[PDB]
Amino acid sequence: TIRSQNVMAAASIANIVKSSLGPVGLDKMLVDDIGDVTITNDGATILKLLEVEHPAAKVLCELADLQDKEVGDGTTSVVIIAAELLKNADELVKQKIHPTSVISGYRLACKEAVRYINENLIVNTDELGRDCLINAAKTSMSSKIIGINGDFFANMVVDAVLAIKYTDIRGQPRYPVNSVNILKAHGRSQMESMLISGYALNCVVGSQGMPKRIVNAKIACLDFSLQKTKMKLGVQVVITDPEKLDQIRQRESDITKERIQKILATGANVILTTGGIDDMCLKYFVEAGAMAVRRVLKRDLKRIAKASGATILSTLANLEGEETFEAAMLGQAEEVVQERICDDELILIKNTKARTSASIILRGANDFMCDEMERSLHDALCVVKRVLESKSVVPGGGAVEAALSIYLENYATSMGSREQLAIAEFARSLLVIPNTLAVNAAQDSTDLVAKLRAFHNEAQVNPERKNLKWIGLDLSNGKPRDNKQAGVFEPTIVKVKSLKFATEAAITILRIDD
Amino acid sequence: EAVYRNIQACKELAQTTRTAYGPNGMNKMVINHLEKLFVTNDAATILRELEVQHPAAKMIVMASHMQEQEVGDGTNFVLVFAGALLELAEELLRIGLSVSEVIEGYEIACRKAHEILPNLVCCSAKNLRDIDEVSSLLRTSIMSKQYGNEVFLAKLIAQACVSIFPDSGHFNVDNIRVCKILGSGISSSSVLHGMVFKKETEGDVTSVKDAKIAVYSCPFDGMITETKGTVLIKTAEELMNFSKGEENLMDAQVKAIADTGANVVVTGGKVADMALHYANKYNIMLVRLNSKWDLRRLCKTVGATALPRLTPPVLEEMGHCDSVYLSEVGDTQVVVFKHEKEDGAISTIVLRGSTDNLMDDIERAVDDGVNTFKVLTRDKRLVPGGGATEIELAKQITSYGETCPGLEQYAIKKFAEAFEAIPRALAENSGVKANEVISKLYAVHQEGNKNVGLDIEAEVPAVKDMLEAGILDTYLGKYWAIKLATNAAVTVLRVDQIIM
Amino acid sequence: SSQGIPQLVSNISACQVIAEAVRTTLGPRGMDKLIVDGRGKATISNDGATILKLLDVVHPAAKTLVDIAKSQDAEVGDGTTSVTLLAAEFLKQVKPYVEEGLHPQIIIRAFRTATQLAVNKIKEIAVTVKKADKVEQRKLLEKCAMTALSSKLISQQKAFFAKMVVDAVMMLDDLLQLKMIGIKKVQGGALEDSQLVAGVAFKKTFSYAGFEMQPKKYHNPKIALLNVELELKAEKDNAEIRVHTVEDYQAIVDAEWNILYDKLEKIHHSGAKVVLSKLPIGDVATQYFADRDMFCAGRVPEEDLKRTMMACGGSIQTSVNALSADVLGRCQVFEETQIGGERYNFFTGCPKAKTCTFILRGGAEQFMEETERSLHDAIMIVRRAIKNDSVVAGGGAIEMELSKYLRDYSRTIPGKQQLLIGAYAKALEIIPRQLCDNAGFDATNILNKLRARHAQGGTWYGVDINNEDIADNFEAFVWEPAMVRINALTAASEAACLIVSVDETIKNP
Ligand SMILES: Nc1ncnc2c1ncn2[C@@H]1O[C@H](COP(=O)(O)OP(=O)(O)O)[C@@H](O)[C@H]1O
């Protein structure tokens, strides 16, 4: 009966997280410390920050966070699936089926799931060739907040991310989120957002005594710095000689002017001021003469250097420079043009040769809906990154779960051993993700999961409806949608690995008997 | 608080009868005072068996019984509508409305509902005495009681009741009665003219078409035997004289056929085969058994004196349905009493049932059928029943509430909500989420169709046009239903404290 | 109790409780139950119909289930257990769903459509071999009864038992309660031989001298149906007479018996020519009946009288009245054969041969009781099967066929009804499960392979109680009639839907 108490504890910890599944999942209260209360609906956060004193919950959550840290998001699904199969296996134990029997059944069901998911319901990284549609659907559902303008986000994302190419083991086509720079802006009509196939920023105006204003055949990757407010102290306070720490400061300013003359002699029109510039220096050198920038984003600086095949650390030991820079920073952008673009004074750089990165400027109207826009773009870019970097995708939502449930029920009806109920009841329990998503979608689960079962049966019993295999639900809807006009998806690797870890957690927690 | 305690009784009664509202409604078992168990759908019989100690419950109970007195169709509508009305009145009093203003608003809203409900009439029973229309009209009441026998009971009620409407002015509902055939299929029931009774009649079948009935209740008695002292008698003269007395009594019967004209007679007391062959030589019939209700109803309808006297027929018992017959339809012999003239041409349904517990339920169904046939007879106008009229009245009352200023506005709004509360209860009974179906139907009623109602037989919240479906409802029945419902509701809300 | 779910779950529990009075008595080898009467009488019966008839049920849900069970008993009699278990398990498998809060009208129409589909599947999959006229089909019914009897595991006399019972039931026996065609069991003797009684007669006569020289082989005896008897010490006259001579006292001893002598003389001269009495008769009375060239049987059971009513065509006399041969029955065979030690007197051959009972003699007690039940079941199944249009494989097989079909249809139908049809199909599994559990408690181990091989391909395979292994329930000659199975499944569905349709129970004490 102590294993049944383990079952009750696991069911409790699963019910804690059930309502948090899915993007429409409700938020959860959890109090690790008396001093503050945390409001989050993220499964990983709620499992990590919360703890349950019962050992079975400890084991289940430890496997869940193993899954989380080793294959990424999905820990909430792992907890829900594992504990539902756990409770259902307890139901079998009340039917006098010994725990080892349902252990063998869960192992066989996991094996058949791994075989079936990889074989019959899968896409070969091409999105069946409909990438310019699934993304169009995906942008719609990844961004509910945007609404009307829609397809333009998709038409930009598809090529702005396909323009990326990382370098890694055998060169997988993973295109990270940082490959595009999000430039929050507003003031214009909410109809467009110019993507920079390359990078963009702003610089000083009027002081542009250099050809960056026009077409540059060759560019640089150079850093920059000018100072008169005590930036560089080569000598310290160690002695009190009253007039002996002001001439080194001014002379460092003069030798920095010598440095920039050594830089401006070579030109190459890409000059970027590094951090540390005091506001006093900012208001000084707009008049005193500076080929500077207003300390543009250092993250953007690093991603620019990566997007130009040359980082200043390869020639200089720091980001300021006192030794003469080598020609390694000679940039190779095909086109650099300054334009009065989007009614702002940006610099526009095309797709720089060698390693490269993308960007976007926002043609927004007012601050807050443009913040909403800056959020939706991040969501869309990150989730499409998930889809493509997965390099293999399973139909998301409840589609794979319902298909696996029906197929495993048939397999159980065609297996014939002591663990025959184990396969079928594993299948029935595995409907918990469709059930939980339907409940969280304000819909009646008994009807939505029913439609999923009916569609998957009709799809895999009569081969005339192969495309009917790809219908699932994740979000509030009146009728479940097909994942070929729609585009809700999950990586097949993370989904199958999360299912494997849920099965393994169930096995480990049922192997503990007395 | 005293008023809320009074309302709680109607609240619990409304929740009790809510499950039984309409087709697909929850069944209920009620226990008779003699522990007899049977399941039923009729809320009227639920109230008949459910004791109601709280006075507000009794208020709603005789509201439903006055509904019985006026028109049988809609008796449960009164109870559930009054319960919803008191729910909304409880909400108003919790808000802080005075009882007087709540009553004023409810009365004015009820008056305008009465004047506007005939504007919701889609059509009328233009073609009575024709099976095609009247069977469909009866279908709604039949399904209201029993959903598994929609059209067969409707058409048998049609073909029966059409035969009891020659006068063209009106007819008496008692002229349609039911008889019992146990252990038989429900589909084997059939209509017959005049009263029929299953149980055997003594003597060979003569069926004189002018048998002016000799009317008695128990003209014969059971077995007895004298005791000379404590111990029994030892002579058969008490039996021989009894047999000869019965023989001479029926000899005087075939004498008194001159002033009585009786080829048939009825009894509740046993007779023997001696009476059998006496009847065979006298060519008469004698029904050996009937129940007390059957005997009494026969006594009134024959319009003749009835008494349990061992006496030959007399002049003061002239039979009404002198044209007597017998039948065997539904593989069961039945005696038949009929009269050829059209006025008061009573007819009966030979109800065939394998289960008495189902048998009295279909008895209640046929009673409501003849009641709604009476409703159509007194007024042919029909209204789109099935929550369509409820939402239409609710929408019109809400339009009034938004257009009429004053303190009664809340009363108007919550009376409209009480009207809305009928289709949501029907949806709860049918097995569909009430909020979504109410919202969908209410949105459909905002434009175009004025008669569309919810589809009970669909799983997803669905709303279908009522006319094309043919489950319409009575105008006058609904009018009186809301009238009595709001009257009882305002009377029970007016009382502030019950007194010992 | 409270409206809706809280009372409906109480109804669920009550139906489970009333199932527990039948749950373990499903199979022919299932557990028997001792039920004690309030009078202090212990009665034993392993058939659910008799158990529920003796058992008083008070809870309204159990009341409705037992009422449906009694209606099925009036229909067939053995289906009581099946219909009760189906109703209880349907309610059990909708319990988690109804507790979830879905409206019971949903499950009402779900069961309605599921059972209509199940009836369609039964009528489609049922098969007929019938054609009983030829000798091959006579011995086919023989092997059916043999499979029903297989507990005996006897040699060819097993087939002889089967042949005798099938012949006795096939000789002009219509569908009836079968009570008149019963059997008796005798000690000693060889089980290979026993008497195919062409009627019914008296169990064991007395040691009177009239028995040994009793007139065997009456050609056409008219029978007398008496209950009042003549015996010693029963009656006497308290007469007092003064002495006048020595020849006078015999008036008193005459008055003690003269009315009895005239009574016996006339009741024997009534027109009957063999007489039966339910109460004990004296040996001296037997000797005066021999003086009437006649014989009497005393202490006859009342079932003898009832079988005389339905078969011999006789009428009760009950006293010295009715000194006429008109109201007296007739027989075509009479004898006495001491069956081993059983001093059985025989009077058989009737205007109606509805009873052609058998008497068993196998020199034991433990075997012939379960033998009585086994022959009862076999002779019942043959007569119900011949009446019906078609027969289907029973013994847990067709329950699985319907379960598989309804699972396949549920998993393809949309809407919330599909979970409910799946629950119905899983609940329909109860009969194989209880057949296995009551037999060897190995329900899961055999049930798994059973369902798997059933889903492998279209077959009528089910559970065999004889070996705890899967056997061809069809062509192993263990059967359930298709029409009877329709009646059982439909009655169980109506009971379940009716009892789960009710929310409140109403009381007015
Ligand atoms: N098939 C149907 N679909 C929708 N509504 C129906 C259907 N059949 C009947 N109704 C409505 O359900 C209402 C239920 O009222 P009810 O309480 O059953 O009347 P009563 O109890 O007096 O016979 C009826 O007025 C009828 O209009």
CATH code, domain carrying A240: 3.50.7.10
Please check whether residues B396 and B497 belong to one and the same domain: yes
**CA C145 centroid distance within chain:** 15
Instruction: Report whether A144 belongs to an annotated binding site.
Output: yes
Of the candidates B355, B380, B405, which is a domain's last residue?
Answer: B380
Q: Which residue type occupies A269?
A: N
What technique solved it? cryo-EM
List residues bridging with A489 in a β-sheet.
A395
C417: nearest Cα among C162, C158, C136, C103: C103
B431 vs C: CB within 8 A: yes
Asked if C60 lies within 8 A of B29 by C-beta distance, the reply is yes
Three-class SS of chain B: CHHHHHHHHHHHHHHHHHCCCCCCCCEEEEECCCCCEEEECCHHHHHHHCCCCCHHHHHHHHHHHHHHHHCCCCHHHHHHHHHHHHHHHHHHHHHCCCHHHHHHHHHHHHHHHHHHHHHHCCEECCCCCCHHHHHHHHHHHHHHHCCCCHHHHHHHHHHHHHHHCCCCCCCCHHHEEEEEEECCCHHHCEEEECEEECCCEECCCCCCCCCCCECCCCCCCCCCCCECCCCECCCCHHHHHHHHHHHHHHHHHHHHCCCCCCCEEECCCCCCHHHHHHHHHHCCEEECCCCHHHHHHHHHHHCCCCCCCCCCCCHHHCCCCCEEEEECCCCCCEEEEECCCCCCCCEEEEEEECCHHHHHHHHHHHHHHHHHHHHHHHCCEEECCCCHHHHHHHHHHHHHHHHCCCCCHHHHHHHHHHHHHHHHHHHHHHCCCHHHHHHHHHHHHCCCCCCEEECCCCCCCCEEECCCCCCCEEHHHHHHHHHHHHHHHHHHHHCCCCCC
Closest residue on chain A to C418 (Cα): A450
Asked if A444 lies within 8 A of B433 by C-beta distance, the reply is yes
The sign of the dihedral angle between the CA atoms of A500, A501, A506, A509 is positive
| C-alpha B476 – ligand 1 centre gap (Å) | 15
Of the candidates B335, B357, B380, which is a domain's last residue?
Answer: B380
A379 is catalytic: yes
Portion 334-353 of A in contact with B at CB < 8 A: none
**Atom nearest to B77 CA in ligand 1:** 17
Portion 335-394 of B in contact with C at CB < 8 A: none
List residues bridging with B181 in a β-sheet.
B352
Q: Is C92 helix (H, G, I), strand (E, B) or coil?
A: helix
User: What are the structure tokens assigned to A92, written together?
Assistant: 């079998």
A151 vs B: CB within 8 A: no
10 Å CB burial of residue A216 (0-12, 13-18, 19+) is: buried
User: What residues in B contact A444, CB-CB < 8 Å?
Assistant: 433
- Cβ distance C496 to C111 under 8 Å? yes
A447 vs B: CB within 8 A: yes
Task: List, chain by chain if needed, residues with CB within 6 Å of any ligand 1 atom.
Answer: B 21-23, 43, 73-77, 140-141, 143-145, 368, 385-386, 453, 456, 471, 473
Atom 16 (ligand 1): residue with closest C-alpha? B22
Q: Which of A95, A421, A454 sits opposite C418 (nearest CB)?
A: A454
* Whole-number Å distance between alpha carbons of A401 and A97: 25
Atom 5 (ligand 1): residue with closest C-alpha? B386
List residues bridging with C161 in a β-sheet.
none
User: What residues in C contact B26, CB-CB < 8 Å?
Assistant: 104-105, 501-503
Residues of B comprising the binding site for ATP? 74-76, 144-145, 386, 473, 478
Please check whether residues B227 and B279 belong to one and the same domain: yes
| C-alpha B351 – ligand 1 centre gap (Å) | 23
User: What residues in A contact C456, CB-CB < 8 Å?
Assistant: 414, 416
- Cβ distance C225 to C325 under 8 Å? no
Q: What is the CA radius of gyration of chain B?
A: 28
Q: Is A360 helix (H, G, I), strand (E, B) or coil?
A: strand
Contacts of C301 (CB under 8 A, 6+ apart): C203, C278
Closest residue on chain B to C102 (Cα): B431
- Cβ distance C185 to C368 under 8 Å? yes
- Cβ distance B283 to B303 under 8 Å? no
DSSP state of A229: S
- Quickly name the fold that domain C197-361 has: GroEL (3.50.7)
Q: Which of B15, B39, B430 sits opposite C105 (nearest CB)?
A: B430
User: What are the structure tokens assigned to A37, written together?
Assistant: 């209360």
Please check whether residues B393 and B451 belong to one and the same domain: yes
| C-alpha C62 – ligand 1 centre gap (Å) | 31
Catalytically active residues of C are 47, 80-81, 377
Helices B99-116 and B409-430, packing angle to 10 deg: 70
Q: What is the CA radius of gyration of chain C?
A: 29
Portion 417-446 of A in contact with B at CB < 8 A: 444
State the best of A92, A94, A108, A413 to mutate against chain C, taking most chain C CBs within 10 Å: A413
Q: Is A215 helix (H, G, I), strand (E, B) or coil?
A: coil
Q: Mutation test of ligand 1: which of B144, B465, B484 has the most ligand atoms closer than 8 Å to its C-beta?
A: B144
Calculate the alpha carbon distances from B105 to B112, B390, B405, B407, B493 in Å: 11, 18, 11, 8, 13
Calculate the alpha carbon distances from B28 to A261, A286, B77 in Å: 99, 90, 17
Portion 430-489 of B in contact with A at CB < 8 A: 433, 459-460
Closest residue on chain B to A448 (Cα): B460
Please check whether residues B198 and B334 belong to one and the same domain: yes
Calculate the alpha carbon distances from C274 to A116, C203, C205, C481 in Å: 84, 16, 14, 43
* Whole-number Å distance between alpha carbons of B142 and B119: 26
- Cβ distance C390 to C127 under 8 Å? yes
Q: Which residue type occupies A46?
A: I
**CA C326 centroid distance within chain:** 34
C501 vs B: CB within 8 A: yes
State the best of C94, C419, C420 to mutate against chain A, taking most chain A CBs within 10 Å: C419
Range of the domain at B218: 194-344
Residues of B comprising the binding site for ADP? 21-22, 74-77, 143-145, 386, 473
Atom 12 (ligand 1): residue with closest C-alpha? B22
Q: Is C478 helix (H, G, I), strand (E, B) or coil?
A: coil
Instruction: Report whether C1 belongs to an annotated binding site.
Output: no
Range of the domain at A364: 195-390
Instruction: Report whether A187 belongs to an annotated binding site.
Output: no
| C-alpha B144 – ligand 1 centre gap (Å) | 4
Element (H, E) at A386: helix A367-389
Q: Which of B15, B27, B51 sits opposite C508 (nearest CB)?
A: B51
| C-alpha B467 – ligand 1 centre gap (Å) | 15
User: What residues in C contact B24, CB-CB < 8 Å?
Assistant: 105, 108-109
A51 vs B: CB within 8 A: no
* Whole-number Å distance between alpha carbons of B137 and C379: 53
Asked if B15 lies within 8 A of C3 by C-beta distance, the reply is yes
C143: nearest Cα among C129, C123, C124, C163: C163
Active-site choice (A75, A256, A274, A503): A75
**Dihedral pair phi/psi, residue C184, rounded to 5°:** -130, 160
Atom 18 (ligand 1): residue with closest C-alpha? B22
| C-alpha B423 – ligand 1 centre gap (Å) | 10
Torsion from C-alpha of C212, C218, C223, C229, nearest 10 degrees: -10
User: What residues in C contact B428, CB-CB < 8 Å?
Assistant: 103
B223 vs C: CB within 8 A: no
Chains within contact range of chain B (3+ C-beta pairs < 8 Å): A, C
**Atom nearest to B150 CA in ligand 1:** 1
